Design a protein around this ligand. Structure first.
Ligand SMILES: CC(=O)N[C@@H]1[C@@H](O[C@@H]2O[C@H](CO)[C@H](O)[C@H](O[C@H]3O[C@H](CO)[C@H](O)[C@H](O)[C@H]3NC(C)=O)[C@H]2O[C@@H]2O[C@@H](C)[C@@H](O)[C@@H](O)[C@@H]2O)[C@H](O)[C@@H](CO)O[C@H]1O
Length: 587
């Protein structure tokens, strides 16, 4: 094995920071990115605590579809990255880079990436120590004839140089299964047998109308646990709102795929944190987002989605490393072997742990994410692990998985019910993770969670998550319900018919909207109420270390009921929030 250029694991997670080439400006002789970020300015802006865990991902976007364009742009940017000097210290501190090398099947009618040879990639790895990996993304919808063969070559050239091959794909049309050899294209399967330590496989949740979120995430987890990938993660995409035909938040009616640029702006900010918790809580460590102008920002400035949700979430996963492969294996009671494409795809989990076909969220954490691998693969390396001795490995064609009811009956015997209420909750060590799982319905949810004898009841509005940690002196609370008001994007439309007919915002228009109405002059959402009730408390708790999004929260209200040894905490907020409550239990 060649020494790895970087570590990627629970203690060293990875946030990919996409920069998309501006092809129109490239035609004018300029080297720029859509949204106005610069490579150097963007990197400088990344908080110093995050720099060790963040890598710039160049994407060739609409560069000219002909030989040389992508090489020219990428070499320019690799040079800029290589020569970067930290202005505080004066030292050359090369910026770490990942190159997008494969997308849209590398069809010459879809992408400039077609004209990036493996030879060139090898040359760039050898020239630039700061090139840490290469990225393939979004070919599930155009599964080119040689895609598996090329993936093998990308993984091999990465292993040769100590870099990572990172592949983000969703299981549309059996893509994940095909990648590993389902239809007889086995070059990548064979490559993985040798080079899996240099592979990162991620979901890409963009094609949301097809409902493959749960099954793709299951595969990503299972591939990792069975040593077919070094680590896993997910690309979480606000374009899902377009794919599913949603418009104004909570409105009725469906507008289809008709208002793209308005639609990718509308997903609630905090909902990206809810999606990301599914990666974290299941041992994933790599995160990426689209649309970048909304999820990260523009003009070397952080969007509020980035600053108030993604940045704080990512800091959390650095401070509290995700469960290790060993831990996740120990916790796994059931491991599925077989093809979700033959068992209804995402429908497999509907009314098991998802509430509907088209969602990136879960309705219970009881089973967390059940890991799986495609039928074409073997569970040999899984069984070889010291930590897999108590796992039931089951064929997907088992009677236990034949129907929704059979699945729950079988799983319920191995995963005990561990909380009450119709809400998402999952426990890790001394921490309850909770979120309201509604996507586009304005319905409050409630749960009852326990820390031994201490009872905690919560009431959450949609697009609200919380992390509640029992600490020696009380409870640490992290809460995020940040959701700005996007109604202005949908003004002049009183129903779905009118919304579908709105003038197109356009790509440039959406970037301008972000600049003039999101980065500044932001239409913040209304403060909204979260309730937390603790039962089994000795005396009125005290509050400590209260902070959160500026101007986003009222002072929490504590109402202690001595007779009943309970406190009711009422929070009115819209943002991220954190505090500690100090108390003793009543005995
Ligand atoms: C399968 C699917 O859902 N979509 C295919 C397209 O892939 C992505 O789909 C989005 C719509 O759901 C959208 O069109 C994405 O591209 C726009 O947004 C990105 C940033 O998020 C860029 O600004 C693009 O320039 C912009 N496109 C346009 C025309 O303005 C699109 O994602 C992009 O393309 C894919 C292939 C991949 O490279 C991604 O990394 C990249 O962001 C697909 O592009 C389209 C082509 O006809 O076909 C859809 O079925």
């Amino acid at each position: 094995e060649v020494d790895k250029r970087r570590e990627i694991n629970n203690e060293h997670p990875l946030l990919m920071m996409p920069l998309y080439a501006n092809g129109e400006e490239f035609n004018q002789g300029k080297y720029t990115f859509w949204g106005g970020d610069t490579l150097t300015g963007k990197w400088e802006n990344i908080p110093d605590d995050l720099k060790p865990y963040t890598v710039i991902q160049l994407h060739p976007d609409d560069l000219p579809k002909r030989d040389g364009a992508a090489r020219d742009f990428y070499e320019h940017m690799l040079e800029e990255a290589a020569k970067y000097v930290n202005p505080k210290t004066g030292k050359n501190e090369p910026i770490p880079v990942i190159l997008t090398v494969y997308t849209a099947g590398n069809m010459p009618y879809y992408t400039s990436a077609h004209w990036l040879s493996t030879s060139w990639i090898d040359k760039m790895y050898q020239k630039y120590p700061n090139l840490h990996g290469i990225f393939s993304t979004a070919s599930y919808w155009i599964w080119a004839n040689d895609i598996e063969n090329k993936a093998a070559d990308y993984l091999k050239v990465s292993a040769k140089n100590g870099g990572y091959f990172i592949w983000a794909e969703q299981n549309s049309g059996s893509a994940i299964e095909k990648a590993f050899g389902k239809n007889g294209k086995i070059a990548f399967q064979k490559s993985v047998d040798k080079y899996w330590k240099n592979l990162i496989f991620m979901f890409k949740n963009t094609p949301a109308a097809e409902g493959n979120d749960s099954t793709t995430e299951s595969y990503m987890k299972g591939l990792w646990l069975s040593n077919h990938t070094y680590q896993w993660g997910g690309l979480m995409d606000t374009w899902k709102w377009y794919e599913t035909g949603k418009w104004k938040l909570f409105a009725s009616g469906n507008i289809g795929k008709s208002q793209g640029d308005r639609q990718w702006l509308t997903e609630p900010e905090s909902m990206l944190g809810e999606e990301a918790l599914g990666v974290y809580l299941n041992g994933g460590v790599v995160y990426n987002f689209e649309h970048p102008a909304y999820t990260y920002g523009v003009n070397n400035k952080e969007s509020l989605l980035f600053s108030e949700v993604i940045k704080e979430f990512f800091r959390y996963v650095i401070a509290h490393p995700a469960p290790s492969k060993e831990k996740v294996l120990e916790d796994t009671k059931v491991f599925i072997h077989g093809d979700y494409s033959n068992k209804g795809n995402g429908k497999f989990f509907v009314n098991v742990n998802t509430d509907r076909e088209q969602t990136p969220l879960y309705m219970t954490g009881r089973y967390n994410v059940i890991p799986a691998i495609p039928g074409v693969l073997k569970t040999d390396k899984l069984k070889e692990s010291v930590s897999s001795s108590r796992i039931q490995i089951k064929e997907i064609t088992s009677p236990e998985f034949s129907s929704t009811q059979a699945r729950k009956e079988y799983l319920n015997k191995l995963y005990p019910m561990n909380y009450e209420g119709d809400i998402f909750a999952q426990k890790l060590d001394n921490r309850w993770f909770v979120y309201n799982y509604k996507v586009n319905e304005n319905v409050k949810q409630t749960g009852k969670l326990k820390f031994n004898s201490l009872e905690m009841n919560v009431e959450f509005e949609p697009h609200t998550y919380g992390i509640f940690e029992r600490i020696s002196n009380g409870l640490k609370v992290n809460l995020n319900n940040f959701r700005t008001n996007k109604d202005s994007l949908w003004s002049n439309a009183q129903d779905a018919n009118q919304a579908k007919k709105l003038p197109q915002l356009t790509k440039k228009g959406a970037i301008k909207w972000i600049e003039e109405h999101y980065i500044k002059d932001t239409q913040f959402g209304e403060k909204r109420v979260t309730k937390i009730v603790l039962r089994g408390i000795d005396k009125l708790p005290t509050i400590h270390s209260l902070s959160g999004t500026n101007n986003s929260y009222d002072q929490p209200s504590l109402n202690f009921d001595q007779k009943n040894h309970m406190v009711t905490i009422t929070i009115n907020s819209n943002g991220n929030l954190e505090f500690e409550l100090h108390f003793l239990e009543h005995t």
